[model samples]
Target: AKRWRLTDPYGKQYEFSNLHHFIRCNNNLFTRKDVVWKRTGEYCNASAGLQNVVAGKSPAWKGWEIEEI
Candidate 1:
């Protein structure tokens, strides 16, 4: 399993993971509104940023990495 630890300014830590697919499923059902709307300008910017990161056109969050099995 993979683990992510996010540290705040005060040194509190929050953990996250993609190893559990259930998290995505649950988020889709209850927190769908939190997602950026695809047709909005904010979404355009976000999409471009994500695309750039995926294509190596720009850097993304520090310490974030992907692994393949």
Candidate 2:
């Protein structure tokens, strides 16, 4: 299985199995509250960003980049 790494605008990185897993995990490590809401918060734009990344569209949020590892 191909793994993926999600790099935030600040240079922090997270690894996951794929984009789907990234969304499923709801992992938000950003320092800004506006970006990564509480891990248990309702769905937010972070999910939207990852979805856009998967769709090859402009990310809904800034500084977040996802790529195959």
Candidate 3:
């Protein structure tokens, strides 16, 4: 069994192909790179990081879940 999808709080789904997929997509699959972090800090090339901005949480925080999808 393996987790194969990343579902955001807003309901968008980012499917995972493998370990490389997670790393690769974070670098290219996202619509934006320099997204705002929690409140002041910023992040680049990370979907999870971008999601943190949307959720109003620090990018460094454990803001999402990894599950068997």
Candidate 4:
């Protein structure tokens, strides 16, 4: 498989290097309350960002734009 990453509208970044498939809202990380398998690694290179639960290992995130860079 290829290394993957994600980016939000505010320039926040994410990586699939160490994440499961959790979800939150409004950029809040402590509000984890779901186990959504939104591992959207295939959505790489999205321009307008995808509407799914993105990787949040380091920085918490909402919707995001996926990419292979």
Candidate 5:
């Protein structure tokens, strides 16, 4: 059996609440093409960049995760 895991920073694990929060925050931040592109890069680097930001290793952006599941 193959299991898929969605990991995020804060070691908070994932649940329905976390997933909702993640989607909300992701939508809020990625609404703008400029912001999204900058973070995601031209080829969706924003997602990776977002992960780094959420992990708390970088201080370039400010935001928090809501849900993760």
Candidate 6:
């Protein structure tokens, strides 16, 4: 499924529709695009990148980890 979610160390949950959704929500936790793109394709659009993350194909975006939900 394309659906997924994340949980922070603090136990707060997060859901995203796209990569920018992750970015806007996590700019405080993950400051650099270089860091984020290192795990996923830099050329991927918002939807594509979110797909990678949601599928657990890419690494964690912050302290939050993604998983099917």
Off by over 4 Å in 2: 18-43
Give a tens-digit lDDT track for model 2, residues 1-69. 888778778878888885544564654554344344445535456666666786778653577887666
lDDT of 2 at 28: 50
lDDT, residue 31, model 4? 23
The RMSD of every model to the true structure, in order and in angstroms, is 8.0, 4.9, 7.9, 9.4, 7.7, 5.5
Order the numbered candidates by lDDT, best leading: 2, 6, 3, 5, 4, 1
- lDDT per residue for candidate 1 within 1-69, as digits (tens), equals 665443333454445564233233444422354343456334433334433454665544232222222
Q: What is the lDDT of residue 24 in candidate 2?
A: 49
Worst 10 residues of 5 by lDDT: 60-69
Tens digits of lDDT, candidate 3, 1-69: 355555545556666655344654464433443332234343333545534544655533233433335
Q: Which scores higher on lDDT, 2 or 3?
A: 2
Count backbone overlaps in model 4: 1
Which segments of candidate 4 are over 4 A away from where they belong?
Answer: 17-63
lDDT of 5: 0.41
Please, what is the TM-score per model? 0.28, 0.54, 0.33, 0.33, 0.27, 0.43
1-69 in candidate 4: lDDT tens per residue? 545566656777776642333222222532233333244442222211242333423233344455554
User: For each candidate, what is the lDDT?
Assistant: 0.39, 0.64, 0.46, 0.40, 0.41, 0.54
* Among all candidates shown, the one with the greatest TM-score: 2
Off by over 4 Å in 1: 1-43, 61-69
- Tens-place lDDT per residue, model 6, 1-69, is 255566665678776545455655566654355334433434323334445766768765444566765
Enumerate residue pairs that collide in model 3: none
Alpha carbon deviation, residue 54, candidate 6 (Å) = 6.3
- Residue 6 shift from truth in candidate 1, angstroms: 14
